[model samples]
Target chain A: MKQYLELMQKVLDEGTQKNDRTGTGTLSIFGHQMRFNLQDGFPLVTTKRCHLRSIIHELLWFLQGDTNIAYLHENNVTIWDEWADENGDLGPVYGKQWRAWPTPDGRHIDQITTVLNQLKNDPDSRRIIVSAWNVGELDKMALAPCHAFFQFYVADGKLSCQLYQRSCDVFLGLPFNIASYALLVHMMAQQCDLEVGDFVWTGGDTHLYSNHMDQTHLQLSREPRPLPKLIIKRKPESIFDYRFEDFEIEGYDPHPGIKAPVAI
Target chain B: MKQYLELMQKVLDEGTQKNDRTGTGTLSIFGHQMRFNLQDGFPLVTTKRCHLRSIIHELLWFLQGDTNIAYLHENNVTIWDEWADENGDLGPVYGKQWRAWPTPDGRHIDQITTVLNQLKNDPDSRRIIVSAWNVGELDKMALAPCHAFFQFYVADGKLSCQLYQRSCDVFLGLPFNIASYALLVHMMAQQCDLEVGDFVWTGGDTHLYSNHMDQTHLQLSREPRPLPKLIIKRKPESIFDYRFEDFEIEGYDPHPGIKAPVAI
Candidate 1:
């Protein structure tokens, strides 16, 4: 949680002002890296009350390889609402790229399946990576992936995952991104029969949108509470088999939720 | 470059031991980041002499979309030689992916050209990225991309670049990787009419190969000299037009070159 606050402060202290594609201005810095030891606690932002319901459902949908927003709507999640077309299709976005990245040779690469298999069989491999930045397909995506690339590393029987986020809205999106990947690491580690190591978050154009300044300042002022612990009630047969009902969060007492605007 | 040395030392102190694909083991750490402010000087490793001739040629070759070792051989740079086939070809690797990434729907996305264009016209856009990690095409390559994804950012009339390297051979490869991208930032800034900013390197599975330990220690024992300055004699017609003869490195006095075994 302190790491989250530290990043927000760094942007406030020295970020450069620039107009973004969303027509909103932003205070941005180029590169930043932070790590959360999952062993300590779930790396949720305790200073502000955050919702994990949407995060959970979205990840599940991604794992299911669903690009249509219909599933999200069924689950009462509207994060993709703005990006969907009339058919509720969001094109080849995260889900499509992660589960079935199309090849020029008429094949689709399932990056998630490949990485999970490697984690089980070749845990020591340095090449165990899953990337959503399919360059050939970017033009087809509703929006390009912000958390574009991630790599998994296993050492000393602990599995660690690092995410490379290309664009970040620090106030609104970062907390969710952190929790999402953190949850992914937990799930992956559980499936691979390894302990959780760390969730290392690296950002490219990390920033705070100009409109969220007051909310950023207010959230930064609150004291960080204890990190909540994640309890996975049961181990699903495979990475894709986990349901939302199998998870619970315990001992998460936070200040209050701070509302902020999405840049898009 | 102290940033380069600090990374090596960190791996030495805290890296985990694991068997690698090369049969040689590694002392591995999951995630690490370091930045070189281009305004200071070029980030070539100064503890020991690092040759810039091969690095410059390799980058130029990548810009040209040539994936054959013939061009590298023509220029006396054999770094990619080990990975080439009998016809001196590396399947759709960096060059092909960078300059002509093929789509399933029959299109080639010239990521490098697209990035350069965006840097000029859409400088504020967060999606100005070049990814070599084409998930669909990884199986066709001789070696998967280690320095897989990179993004360019512009703020206050200065261009900054961040590279996400999935696997870093810290001792033998990192110096070249640093110098290569730092040189790229210089070229892009020159072409885009902007000043040079930071070159941020983010690494996953950053490690010191076991066989390179002696070389790493020898290099670390010496006092680091001031960094060398990169001089591009001509701004060239385009990013791909610069030749190796047009570049020079000055103030690069060092102890000596330390020999290390290539893992492959």
Candidate 2:
């Protein structure tokens, strides 16, 4: 988790102060990269407590390709509440792009399934990529994707994933972002019968919003505990078959949760 | 220039041996990032001589919404020749995706033009992105996009760009990739009436081909010269209006060009 801490500190120390779309000013850096080797431990931030329930449910919903927030609400998650319409629809966001990206010829491409097959069949392929930055559908999306595109790589019987995030609300969103992808890597590696390699997170406009400055400093002041290990209770039949109960975090001890105001 | 050399050195020291799609072996690293501050100079490789003409023309062709190699043939640039079909067509490759990404709704989204508009109107918007990795359209492309997606950022009246490349052939393709995006950044900055900032390049599956080892070492042995300055003779009416004759690269002194075989 030092990588996560270092990114926060880097933004605070050297990031440019800039205004954002949400009207909240931010201490921002244009480009940043962090690598978490899954062999060490799961990369859940340990400086402050983070809820995995929402992360898990959110990922599950995405895997199911459910754009409506009904699944999230049923699981008591409201992280995406602000983006939902009256019908609880968020349009063609991550899930839709991931699982059913629409083609001009009336074909729907499932990127997740394609990548899974590639990992199983052509593990060394450089073209095993899943992109959510669908240019044609950006107007139809409730909000453009921030964690936009990701690629999977395999070397020495291990699977590694790299995510290209176009925008990152570092203080409030990045911890969950790291956890969410790290969890996905674990799940994907399991389904593909490979060991976990690394989760490389590359951000475009990574920032710490002005409102989170105090909370950011306080959280940075705390010493980082060892990263907790992720325990997948069962091997699901497929990538989409895993339930929330299948995940369990072991040996996670952290400081009290830091509350920061959401920019939107 | 030092950043480019450092990445080469890093790959030589730590890259894993792996098989590639071209049946060529490679020493590959999963994830890597390099930042070139445009204020310094244009990021052309100083260790080995590189021609900026092809890069400039290719970018122009992409901006022109071209998918055929006929224009490149007329210009005597055969970089994309191997991927072309019998008609010299590359399907919906970079050029088509950049300027005319087709939608299921029968709309043609021009990402390059759209981004230019955003750069001028809403420089602070985090969503100023141009994506060539349209998930639904990948199979239709002769070759999937390697320098897949890029994002533009503005701070303190300076524009910076970050490119996320899914696959990088570090020895042969990387120098061209760096220069191409740096050129795009400069062009975009000029159009937006802003100064150039940094060009940050992030790569997944960054590798050096096995056969290029000799050339790589030879190139690494040479000292890097100072980076050259890109001088645009005149400002064009729009992003797409720049001609090849309008550009010049000054003071690019280097050792003799190192030739490496292209992997397909």
Candidate 3:
């Protein structure tokens, strides 16, 4: 994806150097956006051989509303291992907020369910939003949401989603974030019986860590291959029913994976 | 100002026709972004004369942790009139959520105070965010927050702000939204002892109501004048201590006001 590389080049060219919460310095920019048309093929970053295993399992786990790392550990995904406590819990993270946001009056608001119903009943609605930035619960979260909020839109029989990421580790997290939302759009479109439109990614404090500078340069040097196609093998009964076996990525050819240290 | 017109034109060219909750049709696009450098000038629309009085009052009201139209009514600003009940109550809207979001465990979180504190202490923190879209408390709100969430950034001795608007009524709401946040950026900059940077605006369902088509075209035909300068007469002791008399917009030359029917 040229769009992906263009942003990377932008970070290198004009990003402000700043010390971040991670204590690792970063070349950062305040605001940035990119659009990946799902119809253009799945927006898997082609310049690097990124793994889809963790991405897929993580999404499925989120859909299940399981904040504990037990489900991920059972499926061999360790991306969240460092964040989990002795109880394997990450407090009220993405899954907890998305599926069941607790209210002051002891009610749980199911944002996902509400969004799905809204899409089916009122496709033109502008209020189809799902936000994981629970202001009241931030202190309890293992880590505050990076991809803090997202909104959905429907037009011309297609469903589109836009994500507002408050912070992004461009080198290490952006690829995974993009793939995850793109996958979500595919799943949501199928459930709504509509064509997939675009996945627009918006970042608040987007950055590339200092340690990932070499990896960023190496990635920029490579050309983006054709975007791979996502094939969902089965039609799930509902949005929450899909399993890992149903997703298949076809025609993905990319350069070697570049190693980079996680900020945490 | 060019950025504002560009988005208006983009909506006319590429936006899909959609029916909205207000029953007025609109030409809508899902995602868009515009950046206004506050160092240049205040981001007030110059192609047409916009009333800055209401915008300033509304902002001050929100900062006061108010959820009623009484303050706005006392100041003769009725921008929020349509959403208020007979008693001028607007439930827990932007003001309530901004100043005091309630927690399930019987605590009220002051998001605005927290943000101001963050700006002064940890300027580089990515979590410097304030949100009005309280998922659990949506039904209580008179109008769900359209200019829903915003974040702050500090770098190079200047402070920047980014707003994530879930819905935009481009013809009617956008200009006011831009100026309001830019004003906020300026105020925050003054408090933190930093210069003004950029005000980045990101929109989800950006649309121009069908009834505003003529006004939109008429406005677009005029050349944009130089932006106005915002003069905050005196720095208030705290973020919440500003008065309506404390602000002024200088050098705002424009064509004329174009009146469009409000969707509500």
What DockQ number belongs to candidate 3?
Answer: 0.91
What docking tier does model 2 reach?
high
lDDT of 1: 0.90
- State which candidate has the highest TM-score: 3
True contacts kept of 3: 0.93
List candidate 1 segments past 4 Å from native.
none
lDDT by candidate, in order shown: 0.90, 0.90, 0.92
Query: Which pairs of residues collide in candidate 3?
Result: none
Clashing pairs in 2: none
Q: Model 1, range B151-240, lDDT digits (tens) per residue? A: 999887889999988888998889889999999999989988899999999999898999999999888888889888888899888888
The worst-scoring run of ten residues by lDDT in candidate 1 chain B lies at: B255-264
Cα error of candidate 1 at position B109, Å: 1.4
Mind giving the per-residue lDDT tens digits that candidate 3 earns over A1-264?
Answer: 798899999999989998888677999999999999999999999899999999999999998997999999999899998888999999999999999999999998889999999999999888999999998888889999998999999999999999999999888899999999999999999999999999999999998899999999899999899999999999999999999999999999988998897656
Q: Candidate 3 docking: what grade?
A: high
Off by over 4 Å in 2: none
Ranking the candidates on DockQ from highest down gives 3, 2, 1
